[PDB]
Amino acid sequence: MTHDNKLQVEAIKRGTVIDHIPAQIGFKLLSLFKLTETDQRITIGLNLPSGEMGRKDLIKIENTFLSEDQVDQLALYAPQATVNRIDNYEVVGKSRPSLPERIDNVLVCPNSNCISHAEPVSSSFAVRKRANDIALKCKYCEKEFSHNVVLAN
Amino acid sequence: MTHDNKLQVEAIKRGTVIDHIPAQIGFKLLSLFKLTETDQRITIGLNLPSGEMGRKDLIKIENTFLSEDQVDQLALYAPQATVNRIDNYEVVGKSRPSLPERIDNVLVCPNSNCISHAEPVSSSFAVRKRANDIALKCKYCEKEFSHNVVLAN
Amino acid sequence: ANPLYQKHIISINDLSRDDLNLVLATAAKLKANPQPELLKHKVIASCFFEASTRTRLSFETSMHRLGASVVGFSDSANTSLGKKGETLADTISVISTYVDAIVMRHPQEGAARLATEFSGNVPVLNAGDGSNQHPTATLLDLFTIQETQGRLDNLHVAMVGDLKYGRTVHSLTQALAKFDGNRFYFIAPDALAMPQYILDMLDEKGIAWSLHSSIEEVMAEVDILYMTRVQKERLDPSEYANVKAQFVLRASDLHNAKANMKVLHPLPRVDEIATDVDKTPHAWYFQQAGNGIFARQALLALVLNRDLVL
Amino acid sequence: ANPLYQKHIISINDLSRDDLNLVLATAAKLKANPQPELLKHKVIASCFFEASTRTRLSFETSMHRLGASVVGFSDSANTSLGKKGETLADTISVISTYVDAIVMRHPQEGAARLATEFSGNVPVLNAGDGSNQHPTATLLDLFTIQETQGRLDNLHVAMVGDLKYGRTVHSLTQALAKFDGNRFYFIAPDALAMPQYILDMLDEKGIAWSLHSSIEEVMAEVDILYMTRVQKERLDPSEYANVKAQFVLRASDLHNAKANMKVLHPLPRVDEIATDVDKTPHAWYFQQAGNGIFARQALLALVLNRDLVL
Amino acid sequence: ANPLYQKHIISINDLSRDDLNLVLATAAKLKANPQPELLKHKVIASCFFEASTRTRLSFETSMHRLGASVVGFSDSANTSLGKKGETLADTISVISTYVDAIVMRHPQEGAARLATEFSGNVPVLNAGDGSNQHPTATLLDLFTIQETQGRLDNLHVAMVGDLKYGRTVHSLTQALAKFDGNRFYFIAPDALAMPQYILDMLDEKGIAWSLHSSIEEVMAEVDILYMTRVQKERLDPSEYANVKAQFVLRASDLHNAKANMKVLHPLPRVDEIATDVDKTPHAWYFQQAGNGIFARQALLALVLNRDLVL
Ligand SMILES: O=C(O)C[C@H](NC(=O)CP(=O)(O)O)C(=O)O
Ligand SMILES: O=C(O)C[C@H](NC(=O)CP(=O)(O)O)C(=O)O
Ligand SMILES: O=C(O)C[C@H](NC(=O)CP(=O)(O)O)C(=O)O
Ligand SMILES: [Zn+2]
Ligand SMILES: [Zn+2]
């Protein structure tokens, strides 16, 4: 039931459909959350128009189901985006990434003298809506950074 | 013109269409080809079925036509790929990647003691089909490597 | 079981005004009537991967004052971690199967936090982790502060020196922010200014703070002058301009000094506090040092002993 | 203009059989008919970023014999590339605006090739780039092989020692493969074996080559025994097992050798050749060294002179 | 005798406008009319107690081009001043009984001036004394500015980088102040600002100069953009915050620049000029380098020749 404007086949049984991802984001989300390292059928649509959502982005992973845990972690890059639960062609569910309280294994603490870089542990940051931006606080070194300076993998 | 063979197919007017991209390679070319820059309705299809060939990845970029070299550089990461020049919903030109004589810039010389690392110069290797693997000779240190080793840049 | 029993003491940010008041009250009872065998039969690991004179020696003296035994190292050079490439995680893994509690100082931020993740049931007491926290120092500062001001609420506190790298001021500033009406005055060079996260925490709780270019600019309205050393060993090369102390405190500077105001310093001091201050009734850093014994005995008593000392 | 006029001498792999023959012929003439002013008014830069005795000294001596002026450095420690962080590209870019030719030895393979991209019309002569090529060495070896055997065809040649890191044998082999019917015997430790790229080339040309675990196996068949030094400065820690010479030549092992066989060595020798070999008609390494003067004058003469008539 | 015959070239501050003009005129002639024997039979000492590539090599090259002999050392590590404790005065006293002129670069300001007091009739040419003067550099810059602008008057010149430790800009500025209507633009970090003694001099002469925090502010007005390297080896630990280049020139920042503006740099460049600037009509640092041969031959010719007629 997508839309209309010159046909092309594109519909799947079960799986997830992250929708309304802002420009130059669909690629990032694909890399960070390794949402591509799978045997499942994926169909990324980049830049495809959507009214107010002028140049939106789209990702569809077949047979793959996210979790309140995962979905929320998207609120850090594509907050407005909407995650649609498609089971048997029918859109059985529909959520929206809300700010999670802690991101794990993804980012890397910008503090170079952080014990987390040397030892065999997984990174972790407490998320906080500071003022203009989101502040990230390392569980270990306890320093906080604008969610913008923090890098990842 | 027509409608593809398998189900989920995406349509476009003019642009390029890389097909037969091996599994787990589609997302990579998307990286070291900086295709994700062009804000042109890009369409990626990961892990699509490939008849007796198993599974293929497939990229589609409208109003974009690969460089006078990219197809040759594309010959290394995915030899059995095909690049279709599609103008006005029609294949006005079909191509197959051909191994060039030498490849410049993209590759990094595996020899650590090669001067190409420390100094400000573009790398370049002389390509040469050997026995099954491609042999690359560094323009600088003159050492020859197996493209297997080299593709660890 | 008292609140802090078997509890890890990594950051003052994890404790509450209650946990602190408990430690201090206990500190005062133990100073009054010592308990020589309270920790009889306990073996504590004293693991310092970074230099120390007061923290380690006071800590270890405290363990003995309470009858406990001490094992450990004062330098990582001869540990297997120092010569055999062993990770901190594995070190704390095997160590935690020998002793009842672990006290550790380390050069990297978060080291103590990391230990709690591999220490099994054994508690970890942070004796200093890089430029992050230093809980037990703060615990003795508060003890000393209350001992000299009568209270910990509504105080005019000035912290001079390297606030950026001073793990002591990080902890202390968070501690006093748990009490009410404390007025802060930060006097540090620009490159070594108090970190943002601390200032934000201050704003949120509506606490009042202000920057000042000189000691004299606040000498008349401060109850506690908390002097610190420039963390030379932690500075980046691009900050070597601040290796020497910009604010040196001299006796003459204590003329317009409030009679009750004391001068504190977590130590060691280099040249930021001239020796003449030593014999003025305002100097209290050596008294402060001595209190580390009571604050550290108190802390150990609560973590390794179930019942609130009788 | 002669074939080599203004050409860069970087890798033997870029010279043809006729180019090599032209240098040897010329070397022959200069060795018997000196040209004290052939290069009067030229200034040549002798730039060695790595140790050297024979190559640098023989090269600069050849320049003076031909009336040229020498300028340069034998240690990069005092250049601005050494103390100021300047890149090699910039060093070559400015130096090339001062001199007429550049002789260069560098620790990294490819340094000479790189120089040609920044030297403008100024030709670059590769005195050695890491473990890659050593062109002028091969020219003096060829000259020496030819004067002792009267030919560069159908020779039975054995190369002993570190063949992996030996730029000398890398260039010498590609040269001898340009002639006909030469048979190669490679005696080296597995870890320091001859690179594959050179062997693929030998096969490509249908040249007969074989491996042997001892010198005694081939002693009665070689016309030239080429001894090399284990390239210690280039060894990888994982190869420190081969620093000691595996194959050592003593005077006794020469009993069943062809009367016309000569023992060659690029030098310096460490322990691979006993000094008692020095007093035998076979030892020719020092004569080979002296020939460096003639081979190198020829090259300089041909590169800086459009027309040469001797 | 020409004005400069036998004079010491120590500081630009001791040369007049006519002396400078005499060197440039001569440089012009030698650049077009070579004098291969102008200095036949002279021996010049090239004494560098500090690193160098352009200055030493260009100087010695110029000596050979003019038929002189060179003698000296590029590293004081092996002189007797280096291993035996000999003073500089004694080094210059004996050396001056061997040679006809002395070219010297030293780590401490004033080393050249000192040499003149111990060299007798032997003239001393200052190739650089610490962060003080760099006379021959300024001569080649002037020559280069003049050939690209056809004048040394009413030029809009900007000097960027480390102006405090840059002997190059110290000498270049005192020179350009000897001409008329030149306007100076100084862009440098506060810590590495232009010394006051030079500015007092500019004011004294009523010369227009101004400071700017970016290159973009003056890009469309300069005729010469003089880029310098941060003098790391001379920085004080308290200045290690400025080792990294603050002002970096890239090819893009050149869009609104005068068509005739040239980018100059004494070299070596570290990161202050992106290499993409190299391919633009504005880049002229390498041409400037080559001009060092002509400026320096002229100086040598004028100092060692009573009468010169070219
Ligand atoms: O050293 C400082 O000034 C701050 C703080 N000081 C102390 O804890 C006192 P000590 O090194 O004697 O244990 C520290 O990091 O050790
Ligand atoms: O060093 C060797 O053993 C072989 C060869 N030897 C030489 O060049 C002799 P030199 O270093 O004395 O000029 C080299 O590649 O450096
Ligand atoms: O070093 C600089 O950056 C400026 C100037 N540069 C030079 O003289 C170049 P060189 O050291 O290669 O002769 C100097 O004062 O040394
Ligand atoms: Zn951290
Ligand atoms: Zn290479």
Side-chain angles (χ1 to χ4, degrees):
Chain A
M1 311 74 133
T2 314
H3 299 80
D4 154 59
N5 195 196
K6 288 66 274 178
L7 186 70
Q8 76 301 109
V9 199
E10 198 72 312
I12 50 174
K13 173 170 289 182
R14 310 171 88 256
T16 303
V17 178
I18 313 78
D19 173 53
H20 297 318
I21 295 170
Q24 178 45 291
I25 300 301
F27 191 60
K28 299 178 178 178
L29 305 186
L30 283 178
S31 48
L32 268 62
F33 311 115
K34 303 168 181 55
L35 305 167
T36 185
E37 301 191 71
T38 186
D39 293 300
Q40 298 312 114
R41 184 161 298 157
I42 302 172
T43 57
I44 307 84
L46 303 169
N47 307 81
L48 63 186
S50 290
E52 334 86 309
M53 200 62 236
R55 186 193 306 297
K56 67 81 163 302
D57 228 315
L58 182 71
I59 298 265
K60 305 167 67 174
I61 322 169
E62 202 185 306
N63 292 43
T64 305
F65 281 129
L66 297 192
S67 54
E68 301 91 305
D69 299 47
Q70 297 202 60
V71 177
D72 252 60
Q73 280 196 165
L74 294 175
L76 228 155
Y77 297 69
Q80 61 311 86
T82 166
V83 185
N84 302 175
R85 265 293 178 295
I86 290 65
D87 181 313
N88 189 195
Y89 310 94
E90 181 70 68
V91 54
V92 301
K94 181 184 180 63
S95 60
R96 196 152 300 173
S98 45
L99 201 49
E101 40 185 40
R102 30 190 255 61
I103 306 290
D104 295 333
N105 292 78
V106 183
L107 325 182
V108 178
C109 183
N111 169 11
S112 70
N113 193 51
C114 183
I115 194 67
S116 59
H117 296 121
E119 301 298 302
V121 295
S122 302
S123 55
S124 176
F125 301 77
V127 189
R128 179 194 70 160
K129 185 179 178 180
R130 198 169 178 295
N132 312 64
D133 58 313
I134 299 175
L136 290 186
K137 177 156 164 296
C138 189
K139 171 193 163 188
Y140 297 109
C141 71
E142 296 184 57
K143 300 275 177 282
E144 63 170 30
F145 324 90
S146 69
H147 93 98
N148 299 69
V149 60
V150 174
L151 225 62
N153 50 265
Chain B
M1 60 169 76
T2 22
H3 304 295
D4 183 63
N5 190 184
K6 306 309 170 184
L7 303 190
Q8 275 54 292
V9 178
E10 311 64 60
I12 60 297
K13 184 154 59 180
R14 61 179 273 114
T16 300
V17 175
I18 319 298
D19 206 309
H20 299 179
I21 297 71
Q24 295 304 314
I25 302 296
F27 188 71
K28 246 54 194 63
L29 286 166
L30 208 70
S31 301
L32 65 178
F33 261 21
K34 288 202 163 184
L35 298 166
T36 173
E37 270 66 20
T38 325
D39 60 305
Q40 293 274 177
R41 199 202 79 61
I42 308 311
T43 279
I44 309 298
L46 303 177
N47 301 310
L48 308 179
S50 186
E52 60 110 353
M53 306 71 74
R55 273 182 293 174
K56 71 161 80 171
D57 276 330
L58 174 152
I59 305 172
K60 295 175 181 172
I61 48 276
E62 58 171 46
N63 293 75
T64 15
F65 295 106
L66 296 197
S67 300
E68 302 134 299
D69 301 299
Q70 286 216 304
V71 184
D72 295 306
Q73 168 186 168
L74 174 55
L76 275 149
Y77 311 123
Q80 69 292 65
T82 75
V83 293
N84 312 308
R85 316 283 179 187
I86 289 78
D87 196 310
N88 187 219
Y89 327 81
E90 240 315 63
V91 184
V92 298
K94 222 285 288 183
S95 321
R96 193 77 50 162
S98 235
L99 259 182
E101 268 95 58
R102 66 159 45 264
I103 196 73
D104 289 42
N105 296 66
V106 321
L107 305 185
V108 174
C109 185
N111 163 26
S112 68
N113 196 44
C114 175
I115 194 271
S116 66
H117 305 313
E119 298 294 313
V121 295
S122 293
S123 59
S124 87
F125 300 76
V127 182
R128 179 187 71 122
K129 182 181 178 180
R130 188 158 36 153
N132 44 56
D133 90 295
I134 313 310
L136 303 179
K137 197 173 68 59
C138 182
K139 175 180 131 189
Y140 294 95
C141 64
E142 293 183 59
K143 286 177 59 184
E144 197 165 63
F145 312 95
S146 179
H147 71 159
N148 166 48
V149 181
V150 181
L151 296 177
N153 292 166
Chain C
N2 72 64
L4 299 168
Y5 183 67
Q6 295 302 293
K7 215 70 60 180
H8 291 310
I9 304 302
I10 313 303
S11 172
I12 285 74
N13 201 235
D14 298 327
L15 305 175
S16 64
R17 171 174 170 167
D18 290 309
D19 302 324
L20 299 182
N21 274 144
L22 170 54
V23 177
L24 298 184
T26 305
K29 288 194 203 69
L30 281 177
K31 180 176 185 169
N33 44 77
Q35 298 200 49
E37 303 179 307
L38 195 136
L39 296 182
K40 194 176 213 59
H41 294 171
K42 298 291 188 172
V43 172
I44 305 307
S46 182
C47 312
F48 285 63
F49 297 76
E50 180 165 64
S52 180
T53 293
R54 300 154 188 79
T55 299
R56 186 176 72 79
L57 296 188
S58 76
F59 244 126
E60 285 181 31
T61 294
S62 295
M63 307 177 183
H64 289 304
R65 248 69 224 241
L66 303 188
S69 289
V70 186
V71 291
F73 44 77
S74 44
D75 166 46
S76 61
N78 279 74
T79 60
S80 275
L81 170 159
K83 298 287 171 58
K84 298 172 182 169
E86 167 152 58
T87 69
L88 181 61
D90 282 2
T91 294
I92 291 152
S93 285
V94 311
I95 283 307
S96 71
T97 86
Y98 306 157
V99 301
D100 296 305
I102 302 173
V103 176
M104 62 164 330
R105 173 171 278 188
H106 197 290
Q108 286 159 269
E109 289 81 48
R113 182 71 62 191
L114 185 292
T116 70
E117 270 165 50
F118 300 96
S119 70
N121 48 300
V122 185
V124 181
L125 310 196
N126 180 15
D129 66 312
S131 64
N132 182 34
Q133 289 289 312
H134 195 175
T136 81
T138 288
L139 282 169
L140 73 86
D141 297 320
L142 287 181
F143 187 77
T144 300
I145 289 176
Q146 171 181 68
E147 183 196 67
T148 58
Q149 307 307 290
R151 61 166 190 296
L152 298 175
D153 291 290
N154 293 299
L155 290 162
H156 284 272
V157 185
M159 287 171 193
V160 194
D162 177 343
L163 313 178
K164 170 187 185 179
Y165 293 116
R167 51 188 178 199
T168 58
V169 296
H170 294 172
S171 289
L172 182 57
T173 296
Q174 285 175 153
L176 296 172
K178 295 174 174 303
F179 294 93
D180 312 288
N182 291 316
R183 175 59 193 299
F184 289 115
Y185 308 75
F186 304 139
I187 308 171
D190 278 74
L192 304 176
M194 181 73 79
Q196 272 281 45
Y197 66 80
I198 296 163
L199 296 175
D200 294 353
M201 171 273 270
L202 291 180
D203 295 321
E204 257 128 89
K205 306 192 65 174
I207 311 168
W209 60 275
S210 56
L211 308 192
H212 297 252
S213 293
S214 75
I215 290 66
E216 53 193 302
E217 192 182 313
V218 306
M219 190 74 268
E221 62 190 63
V222 297
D223 302 299
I224 287 79
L225 190 53
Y226 198 79
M227 298 291 290
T228 70
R229 160 184 85 90
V230 173
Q231 301 300 283
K232 183 180 180 298
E233 67 268 31
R234 298 178 205 292
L235 289 173
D236 177 77
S238 69
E239 304 171 298
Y240 285 1
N242 305 292
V243 64
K244 164 171 284 194
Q246 289 192 181
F247 310 105
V248 169
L249 183 75
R250 306 171 178 297
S252 71
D253 305 313
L254 304 180
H255 68 311
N256 276 33
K258 195 178 297 187
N260 78 302
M261 172 288 279
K262 321 304 292 183
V263 183
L264 302 193
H265 202 306
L267 298 186
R269 67 162 163 188
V270 170
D271 62 312
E272 61 273 359
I273 294 70
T275 65
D276 51 39
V277 181
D278 289 12
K279 43 186 179 178
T280 68
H282 290 293
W284 207 254
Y285 27 88
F286 291 128
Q287 286 70 11
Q288 169 183 13
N291 281 166
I293 289 298
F294 308 119
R296 267 144 196 162
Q297 291 199 200
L299 188 65
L300 287 170
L302 298 159
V303 175
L304 306 169
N305 207 266
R306 180 176 63 68
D307 287 315
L308 187 177
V309 303
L310 295 176
Chain D
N2 65 75
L4 301 184
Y5 179 60
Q6 294 290 295
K7 296 304 99 170
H8 293 300
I9 311 303
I10 306 305
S11 179
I12 281 299
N13 195 287
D14 300 311
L15 309 177
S16 76
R17 182 175 188 160
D18 300 309
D19 292 305
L20 295 177
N21 269 150
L22 183 54
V23 177
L24 297 187
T26 306
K29 291 183 177 180
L30 289 173
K31 186 168 190 295
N33 185 56
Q35 299 301 305
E37 261 104 55
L38 194 56
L39 294 177
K40 192 183 177 186
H41 294 156
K42 297 296 166 56
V43 186
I44 298 175
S46 176
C47 311
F48 287 68
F49 298 80
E50 179 177 62
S52 178
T53 291
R54 280 147 285 274
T55 305
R56 184 170 79 68
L57 295 190
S58 68
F59 244 127
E60 283 173 28
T61 301
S62 297
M63 299 172 191
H64 290 301
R65 291 298 183 194
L66 296 181
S69 286
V70 183
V71 68
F73 50 77
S74 43
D75 171 31
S76 60
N78 287 296
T79 57
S80 287
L81 161 162
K83 297 276 161 290
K84 302 178 180 197
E86 177 159 55
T87 66
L88 178 65
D90 285 2
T91 294
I92 294 299
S93 283
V94 305
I95 286 311
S96 75
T97 76
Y98 305 167
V99 301
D100 300 307
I102 303 169
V103 179
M104 192 205 320
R105 168 167 280 191
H106 198 286
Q108 344 232 79
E109 294 83 40
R113 183 79 60 189
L114 178 93
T116 66
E117 309 188 339
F118 292 94
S119 60
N121 331 87
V122 183
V124 169
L125 287 76
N126 179 32
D129 65 318
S131 59
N132 185 25
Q133 296 291 310
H134 197 174
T136 82
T138 293
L139 283 170
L140 78 89
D141 299 327
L142 285 190
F143 187 63
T144 299
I145 287 165
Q146 157 163 289
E147 87 171 5
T148 49
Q149 314 302 303
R151 64 183 197 299
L152 291 177
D153 309 283
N154 311 91
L155 291 180
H156 284 84
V157 179
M159 290 173 191
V160 185
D162 172 349
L163 311 186
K164 177 184 176 181
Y165 292 118
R167 53 187 170 199
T168 60
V169 316
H170 291 167
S171 289
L172 179 54
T173 298
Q174 303 182 314
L176 292 176
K178 295 186 147 65
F179 296 79
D180 310 309
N182 284 315
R183 201 193 182 308
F184 295 98
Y185 297 103
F186 302 140
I187 300 69
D190 301 297
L192 305 175
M194 181 73 79
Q196 192 64 49
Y197 70 86
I198 286 172
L199 297 184
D200 289 4
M201 182 271 281
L202 287 182
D203 282 342
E204 190 104 23
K205 308 302 175 185
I207 304 167
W209 63 270
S210 55
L211 314 178
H212 300 275
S213 64
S214 80
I215 299 176
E216 205 138 297
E217 281 174 47
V218 297
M219 190 52 96
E221 286 179 57
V222 294
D223 290 300
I224 291 82
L225 182 54
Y226 201 76
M227 299 298 286
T228 62
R229 174 186 70 98
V230 170
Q231 305 295 284
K232 198 170 70 169
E233 338 85 70
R234 303 188 203 294
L235 282 180
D236 176 291
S238 62
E239 303 171 312
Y240 283 4
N242 309 98
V243 299
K244 305 302 173 188
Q246 177 151 164
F247 310 110
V248 171
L249 180 69
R250 290 237 57 182
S252 71
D253 314 313
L254 292 175
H255 77 299
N256 61 318
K258 275 161 154 275
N260 73 286
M261 90 88 98
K262 296 296 180 169
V263 189
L264 295 198
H265 191 309
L267 301 192
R269 65 170 154 188
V270 178
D271 63 297
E272 61 264 34
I273 301 86
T275 69
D276 69 348
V277 173
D278 290 7
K279 308 174 179 188
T280 66
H282 298 291
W284 208 256
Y285 21 100
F286 294 130
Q287 283 79 0
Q288 169 188 1
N291 273 160
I293 292 68
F294 307 117
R296 276 160 197 139
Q297 279 191 53
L299 195 63
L300 284 169
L302 296 172
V303 179
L304 294 163
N305 268 290
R306 193 186 300 274
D307 236 56
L308 201 62
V309 58
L310 303 163
Chain E
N2 65 75
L4 301 184
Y5 179 60
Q6 294 290 295
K7 296 304 99 170
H8 293 300
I9 311 303
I10 306 305
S11 179
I12 281 299
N13 195 287
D14 300 311
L15 309 177
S16 76
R17 182 175 188 160
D18 300 309
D19 292 305
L20 295 177
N21 269 150
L22 183 54
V23 177
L24 297 187
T26 306
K29 291 183 177 180
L30 289 173
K31 186 168 190 295
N33 185 56
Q35 299 301 305
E37 261 104 55
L38 194 56
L39 294 177
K40 192 183 177 186
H41 294 156
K42 297 296 166 56
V43 186
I44 298 175
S46 176
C47 311
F48 287 68
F49 298 80
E50 179 177 62
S52 178
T53 291
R54 280 147 285 274
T55 305
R56 184 170 79 68
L57 295 190
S58 68
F59 244 127
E60 283 173 28
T61 301
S62 297
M63 299 172 191
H64 290 301
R65 291 298 183 194
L66 296 181
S69 286
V70 183
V71 68
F73 50 77
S74 43
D75 172 31
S76 60
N78 287 296
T79 57
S80 287
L81 161 162
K83 297 276 161 290
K84 302 178 180 197
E86 177 159 55
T87 66
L88 178 65
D90 285 2
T91 294
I92 294 299
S93 283
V94 305
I95 286 311
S96 75
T97 76
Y98 305 167
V99 301
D100 301 307
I102 303 169
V103 179
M104 192 205 320
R105 168 167 280 191
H106 198 286
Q108 344 232 79
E109 294 83 40
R113 183 79 60 189
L114 178 93
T116 66
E117 309 188 339
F118 292 94
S119 60
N121 331 87
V122 183
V124 169
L125 287 76
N126 179 32
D129 65 318
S131 59
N132 185 25
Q133 296 291 310
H134 197 174
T136 82
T138 293
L139 283 170
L140 78 89
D141 299 327
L142 285 190
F143 187 63
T144 299
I145 287 165
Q146 157 163 289
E147 87 171 5
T148 49
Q149 314 302 303
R151 64 183 197 299
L152 291 177
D153 309 283
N154 311 91
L155 291 180
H156 284 84
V157 179
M159 290 173 191
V160 185
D162 172 349
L163 311 186
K164 177 184 176 181
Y165 292 118
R167 53 187 170 199
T168 60
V169 316
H170 291 167
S171 289
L172 179 54
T173 298
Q174 303 182 314
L176 292 176
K178 295 186 147 65
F179 296 79
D180 310 309
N182 284 315
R183 201 193 182 308
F184 295 98
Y185 297 103
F186 302 140
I187 300 69
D190 301 297
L192 305 175
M194 181 73 79
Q196 192 64 49
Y197 70 86
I198 286 172
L199 297 184
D200 289 4
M201 182 271 281
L202 287 182
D203 282 342
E204 190 104 23
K205 308 302 175 185
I207 304 167
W209 63 270
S210 55
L211 314 178
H212 300 275
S213 64
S214 80
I215 299 176
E216 205 138 297
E217 281 174 47
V218 297
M219 190 52 96
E221 286 179 57
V222 294
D223 290 300
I224 291 82
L225 182 54
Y226 201 76
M227 299 298 286
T228 62
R229 174 186 70 98
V230 170
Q231 305 295 284
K232 198 170 70 169
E233 338 85 70
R234 303 188 203 294
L235 282 180
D236 176 291
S238 62
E239 303 171 312
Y240 283 4
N242 309 98
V243 299
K244 305 302 173 188
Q246 177 151 164
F247 310 110
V248 171
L249 180 69
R250 290 237 57 182
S252 71
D253 314 313
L254 292 175
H255 77 299
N256 61 318
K258 275 161 154 275
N260 73 286
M261 90 88 98
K262 296 296 180 169
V263 189
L264 295 198
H265 191 309
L267 301 192
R269 65 170 154 188
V270 178
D271 63 297
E272 61 264 34
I273 301 86
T275 69
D276 69 348
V277 173
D278 290 7
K279 308 174 179 188
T280 66
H282 298 291
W284 208 256
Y285 21 100
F286 294 130
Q287 283 79 0
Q288 169 188 1
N291 273 160
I293 292 68
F294 307 117
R296 276 160 197 139
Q297 279 191 53
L299 195 63
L300 284 169
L302 296 172
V303 179
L304 294 163
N305 268 290
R306 193 186 300 274
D307 236 56
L308 201 62
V309 58
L310 303 163

